[PDB]
C-alpha cells in the first residue's frame, strides 16, 4: 500500500538510508501527484523533496526509482511557472537529458514528457532545454526506417514535446534549432496517427507565426500541399491547427500566398466558411481577408472558386467577430480589385449586408465599412454610375445610417461619413 501516504511519511522514507524504503516513499509521492483531485504540488516542494528526486534520476542501478522520480517530477513541472521553476532549479534538465538514453523505453518516455512540460513553460526555459542539448537525443529516438514500429503513445509524447520546442515568441526559437527539427516534423506530418498529425500541425503553426523569413523556412520544405490535405480532414483537432498554419503563411509575401493557392486551398473554403465551429469560420475569414489583400490575379482566383457569395453570406449572418473579419476582406478586395471585380462583388449582393453592419457598436468596423463604400463609389465614378449606387444604398436603409453617423464621436467616422453625404447624396 503506497496509496494515501502523508507528506510526513514520504519524507521519513526518502530520508532513510535504505534504497528500497526510498523507492516506496517515492512511489507514494508519484501516486499523490497523479490523483485527479488537487495534487499537493506545493506541499511536496516545501518539504524539500525536489533535489532528492533529481538525484534519484541518476541511480542507473535501480531503474524503478528512476521511473518513479521521473514521473513525480513530470507532474510537479506540469504546474505553474513557479512550480516548474522549482524543478529546473533542482538540476533536473541535464538529468532528464541523460535519461533519454535509458534502455528502458518507459523511462526515456517519461524524460521526454518531463522536458516537454519544462519547455512548455515559455521562451526562456525552452531555450534552456535547447542549450543543454536536448534536441540531438530527442531526434535520435525517431531515427527509424518506419515510424509505425514505435509505440503509439511513445511517438505521441515525442511529437508533443517537439511542438513545445517550436512554441512561444519574444523570442521565437533559435533558427539553428528550427532547421534541425524541421526535417523530422515534415516526416511526422505524413504519419497516420491523428494525434501525431494534430501536434505536428500545431508545431508548424507556431513556426509560421512570424516574419517572412520564418514562413520561408517552412514553405521551402514543401509542406504546403500536405497542409492543404490536412485542411480537408474530418477531425476538427487536425483542421484547427492546419488552418492556423495556412493563415499564417498568407500573411507573408504574395509569392508565399500563391503557393497556398497553387496547392488547392481555396477549394476547401466553401466548407470552412460555413463550418459549424465559430473559430473555424473566424479563422477561415481572416485567411480570406489576407488573400483579398494580394494581387489582382489572386483576387481573381477567389472569384473563380465561387467564394465571393460565401463572403456575402458570412457578412449577412455569423458571429460578430467573424463578420468583422469579413468586412476587412471586403475592404481589401475593393481596395486592390479591378473595376470588373468590384462590379461583380456588388452583383453578388454585398451592399445590403454591408449597410446593416453600420449600426454595430464597434468603432473600427464602421471605419472599415466606410472605406469599402468609398472604394466602391470610386469604381462607380469610373463607370459614371454613382447614381445607381446612391439609389441602391438609399433603397435598403443605408443613407439613414450614413447620415446619422455624421454626428458621431470618432473623428475618422464623422469626417468620412460627412464626405460621402456631401459628395454622392446632394
Amino acid at each position: 500500500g503506497t496509496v494515501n501516504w502523508s507528506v510526513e511519511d514520504i519524507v521519513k522514507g526518502i530520508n532513510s538510508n535504505n534504497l528500497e524504503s526510498q523507492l516506496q516513499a517515492t512511489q507514494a509521492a508519484r501516486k499523490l501527484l497523479s490523483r485527479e483531485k488537487q495534487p499537493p504540488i506545493d506541499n511536496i516542494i516545501r518539504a524539500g523533496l525536489i533535489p532528492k528526486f533529481v538525484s534519484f534520476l541518476g541511480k542507473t542501478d535501480c531503474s524503478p526509482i528512476q521511473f518513479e522520480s521521473a514521473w513525480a517530477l513530470t507532474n510537479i513541472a506540469s504546474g505553474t511557472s513557479e512550480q516548474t521553476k522549482a524543478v529546473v532549479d533542482g538540476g533536473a534538465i541535464p538529468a532528464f537529458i541523460s535519461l533519454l538514453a535509458s534502455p528502458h523505453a518507459h523511462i526515456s518516455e517519461q524524460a521526454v514528457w518531463a522536458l516537454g512540460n519544462i519547455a512548455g513553460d515559455g521562451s526562456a526555459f525552452r531555450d534552456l532545454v535547447i542549450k543543454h542539448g536536448a534536441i540531438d537525443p530527442l531526434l535520435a529516438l525517431l531515427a527509424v526506417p518506419d515510424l509505425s514500429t514505435l509505440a503509439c503513445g511513445y511517438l505521441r509524447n515525442l511529437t508533443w514535446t517537439l511542438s513545445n520546442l517550436c512554441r512561444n515568441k519574444n523570442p521565437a526559437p533559435p533558427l539553428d534549432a528550427v532547421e534541425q527539427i524541421l526535417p523530422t516534423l515534415v516526416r511526422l506530418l505524413h504519419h497516420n496517427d491523428p494525434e501525431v498529425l494534430a501536434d505536428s500541425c500545431w508545431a508548424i503553426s507556431y513556426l509560421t507565426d512570424g516574419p517572412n523569413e520564418r514562413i520561408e523556412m517552412v514553405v521551402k520544405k514543401g509542406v504546403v500541399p500536405q497542409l492543404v490535405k490536412l485542411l480537408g480532414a474530418t477531425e476538427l483537432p487536425i483542421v484547427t491547427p492546419a488552418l492556423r498554419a495556412i493563415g499564417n503563411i498568407v500573411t507573408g509575401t504574395d509569392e508565399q500566398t500563391q503557393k497556398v493557392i497553387d496547392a488547392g486551398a481555396l477549394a476547401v473554403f466553401p466548407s470552412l466558411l460555413t463550418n459549424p465551429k465559430t473559430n473555424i469560420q473566424k479563422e477561415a475569414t481572416w485567411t480570406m481577408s489576407n488573400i483579398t489583400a494580394g494581387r489582382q490575379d489572386q483576387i481573381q482566383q477567389v472569384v473563380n472558386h465561387g467564394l465571393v457569395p460565401f463572403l456575402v453570406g458570412v457578412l449577412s449572418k455569423a458571429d460578430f467577430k467573424t463578420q468583422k473579419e469579413a468586412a476587412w476582406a471586403i475592404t481589401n478586395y475593393t481596395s486592390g480589385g479591378t473595376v470588373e471585380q468590384i462590379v461583380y462583388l456588388v452583383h453578388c449582393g454585398i451592399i445590403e449586408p454591408l449597410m446593416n453592419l453600420l449600426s454595430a457598436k464597434d468603432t473600427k468596423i464602421i471605419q472599415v465599412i466606410l472605406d469599402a463604400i468609398s472604394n466602391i463609389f470610386q469604381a462607380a465614378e469610373k463607370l459614371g454610375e454613382t447614381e445607381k449606387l446612391s439609389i441602391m444604398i438609399e433603397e435598403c436603409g443605408g443613407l439613414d445610417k450614413i447620415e446619422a453617423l455624421q454626428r458621431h464621436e470618432n473623428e475618422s467616422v464623422y469626417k468620412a461619413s460627412l464626405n460621402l453625404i456631401e459628395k454622392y447624396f446632394s
Partner: peptide, 8 residues
Amino acid sequence: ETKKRRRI
C-alpha cells in the same frame, strides 16, 4: 494547444 500535461 495544451501547454503542459499531468500524468494521471
